[model samples]
Target: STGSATTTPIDSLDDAYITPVQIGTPAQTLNLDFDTGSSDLWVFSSETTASEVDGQTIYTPSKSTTAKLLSGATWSISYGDGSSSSGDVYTDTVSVGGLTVTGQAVESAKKVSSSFTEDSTIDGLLGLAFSTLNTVSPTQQKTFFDNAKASLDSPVFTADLGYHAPGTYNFGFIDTTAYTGSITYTAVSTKQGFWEWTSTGYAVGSGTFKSTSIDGIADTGTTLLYLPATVVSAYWAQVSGAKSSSSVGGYVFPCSATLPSFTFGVGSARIVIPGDYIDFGPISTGSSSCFGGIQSSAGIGINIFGDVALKAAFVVFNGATTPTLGFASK
Candidate 1:
């Protein structure tokens, strides 16, 4: 069987995408972020501290007759970017879009960091990466996809992250209409529990394509495109007003600058991210100086093909026996 879930982006910058997922017998629907960067399906729950809970919806497992406590199971994750949260585990019926999973591990939150509390729109994360990234201790749990793969038509899922628009996550089948050109695929090394692959290279605007191999993960959880400093510098140098500023943090540039498109290769195919996507948006609303969507991965140590790159193409996370990633222009 196959299913689809809609992901709606939040904030003007489209920093995060949330999808409505049903948990428990009575269907406690919460808008959770489906992050491809991590594993472990967690949610804000009634067990959390009142002060730590804000405008976000919570999943009260007690109210769900189908919910059963996973005795002694607990989970914790630190994003280091203020989005840390942790809690206990429960097995409950979870339905996303048209697909349903019985006894899915529904991690219920006991404590959450300030960033999660402030962002009420995101109830938690439905991690889509390899289950090895799951933070649950003792008997670690499988991800939603891992559990559903057995019954799925093709044991695969596709991500079509949109910019300024609601996106889609399709399970099992590749939507031929969702992308243009034939899908180009490459073997993915899931040893890191990430959808990691090496890019063929990149090109700046109309410049010659660089014959360099760049390894990166296709992370939906991250907001920007982070490549090597050399690539980032090359792209920014093309923009007269662009510069990396310590004061402003990372790269910032004039909004009016004629930014060039960024093209990255996957096998023999290329996906072009429009310059508009690269500009991100002004640091301050209505301000002329804008933060770049492409930043240096110098800190991360590996290229991160995050939302900025994912939104530019139709990406397939093939969960076959040996996983492979498919990329195609949309």
Candidate 2:
């Protein structure tokens, strides 16, 4: 599967789970999820109510200090992972960390079903990816970023995990202090929220990666950095004491062995993925190390630079422009 259930924090409540962000915040809190695979926000209506969802959270008009709901507005979102939902439009005070966006655009759940509904732990999804895939359009009437940007202190929002847990999702305002040094922003090719691209080639040992022409997209949702088979093999060859262990899902060299350096070409930017990161250990028999970069996605069209590759670098997702995404590192 390309994508699976992800967890993020809903608020200061410290409840980090894979639930949807309910529309009509402050007034109504519905079960929601944070999805980076697509750009849109929505909730499940058929199974939603103030009391119906047990493990999931519901937006209650009375509990919140301030809240509002739009009776007529509707929202719908479809994801590449085969999850989707639809609902009416609502507005309420939404916050993440120390920043909050009052009157944020949110979709109330009316009807929803996909792989997400079956999971009792999931209530809804929060679309935190790119805006190109947003269900909310000017023609559609409203969107999450559109409303949040108006009230935000900065054009950027940073998602920081409260702990190492899976369901840690934080929103609003970028933490500039998270990293160190200068940063540059890369423009997005598509308006879609997904940061996608193809790899030109792979690098192992000390030499540079092969001549690459393909432009690969980088994503934070995916766990493994999927690459072509030939490239995967080329990278494995460079490991001196490294051996390819099929059980780990990728090549696993000695954790303490001499690590090599790898680089990915993003336009003129050559991203160097160090050796320690390359030798990720297997979480399970078929799972490689959490930090492993290369995985098998031969038939897959686009190369995904998932969190394994991302953890090594500082990422900044700038949504200042309506259809543009910015990339920078510390």
Candidate 3:
């Protein structure tokens, strides 16, 4: 049987998508971010320091009869945005949509960074990355997807993210009605436990396409599209009032700037990011400034095709031998 679930954007934050997931016996439900950039299923739990909890819901392990401690095992994880968490590990039943996996490793946070604690609505993260990236010490654990894939009718899943709207993530099967036109396929290299691929070329607005190699990760957890600094500069130069601001931490432009569309080449397919989507809302309330969703990936080393880029297409994370990516306009 297949599984599917609707993902809702975090209200005004709109920085990430959240979906409901059930964990432990009696099924305590929590809203989790489905992140493909990392492989660790962790949650705010009773084990967390009370001072660090903030307004987030904490998972009560004692309430679940099926929860078992993985004696001496612990986990710690840090994200690209400098957010981090650490905790002990437990094995319990975890369910996403209608799909359930028994004895799934569920990391219970004992400590969390300000980045996580401040985001009270997100109770946890459901990592969809390859199992090799799991952070459990002594023994690396399998992610919910990795554990569930063996039983799935088809070892593939699709991500249909929306801009300030609800979207669906489908597992074990692909739903044809969700996308228009044919899905274009590209080979993915999972050498670093990421859905890494090379783009054929890119273009800014209606400008000529330039052939350049771009190696990046298809990351659902990341909010913005990060490209090379040179490419980022080239795109923003086309906008009249755009400027790279050290104060804002990235490039920003007037809210009314007529921005240019950016396109990334996927084989023969051109996944174009609309000009408006590049304007990632206002920098502050009633401010005439807005941040550009596309930024420089200079310090980060590798580029990231984050939510901004993914939302532009219906993306299929194909897990067949030699994993691949399939893209189609939604």
> Scored by CA lDDT, what does every candidate get?
0.91, 0.52, 0.91
lDDT value for model 2: 0.52
Model 1 vs. true fold: TM: 0.98
Error of 3 at 188 (Å): 1.3
Candidate 3 global CA lDDT score: 0.91
| Residues 207-303 of candidate 1: C-alpha lDDT, one tens digit per residue | 9999899999999989999999999999999998799999887999988898899999998889999988886787876999999999999976677
Name model 3 segments beyond 4 Å from true: none
Q: Return the TM-score for candidate 3, rounded to 2 decimals.
A: 0.97
How many Å off is the CA of 274 in candidate 1? Answer: 0.6
The weakest ten consecutive residues by lDDT in model 2 span: 1-10
Query: How well is each residue in 227-299 modelled by candidate 2, as lDDT tens digits?
Result: 7777776776666555556665456654455666767654455556666555444444453333345665565
Comparing candidate 2 with candidate 3, which one achieves the higher lDDT?
Answer: 3
lDDT of 1 at 175: 96
For candidate 3, what's the RMSD?
A: 1.1
